[PDB]
Design a protein around this nucleic acid. Structure first.
Length: 118
RNA sequence: CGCGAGGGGAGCCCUAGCACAGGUGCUGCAUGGCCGUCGUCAGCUCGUGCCGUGAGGUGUUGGGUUAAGUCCCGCAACGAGCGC
């Protein structure tokens, strides 16, 4: 089930504007674009979900983020459809790093959300 | 007190003396207060996060607008205070 899906049309991307580090994940350069090695992809997908799963079952929250248009919307979906926080707009600076202070606004949200109906 | 004369006496006053007052005498570079000026000009900063060996940055650089740090949209920043 997996392979086919991917092999479908979900691999190989940016071309000639890469990073040599990422050279471990790549099959070849067809007509220009870098054809990522899915074979290896799979292997990694595993360990990844393993982690996700080994966490999704222990009451742990995850934070998804995607501030790019060619991927905004969807991320908005998959998040609400999982109750997992997320970021679709401008990922403010110091969120995680200055949470306590960013939160201050979240509180200001309800501060109004309440004064809304009154 | 006292028949009374007169005698003691608390304020206030006059003399004497003691302790002290008073000085627009100096220092506005010892000061408080208050006033004048840049100028009512659009400005000056703070809390936390982040960058930087550090002084310090970022915020408050950029795009449009305004009498305006006025408002907006952007953004490793997220907000706030004194000014407007």
């Amino acid at each position: 089930v997996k392979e086919l899906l991917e092999a479908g049309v979900h691999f190989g991307h940016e071309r000639k504007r890469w990073n040599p580090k990422f050279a471990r994940y790549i099959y070849a350069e067809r007509n220009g674009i870098h054809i990522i090695d899915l074979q290896k992809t799979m292997e990694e997908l595993e360990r990844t979900f393993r982690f996700i799963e080994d966490l999704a079952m222990r009451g742990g929250t995850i934070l998804f983020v995607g501030t790019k248009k060619q991927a905004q919307d969807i991320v908005r979906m998959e998040a609400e459809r999982a109750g997992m926080p997320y970021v679709n707009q401008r990922w403010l600076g110091g969120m995680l790093t200055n949470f306590k202070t960013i939160s201050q606004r979240v509180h200001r949200l309800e501060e109004l959300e309440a004064l809304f109906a009154s």
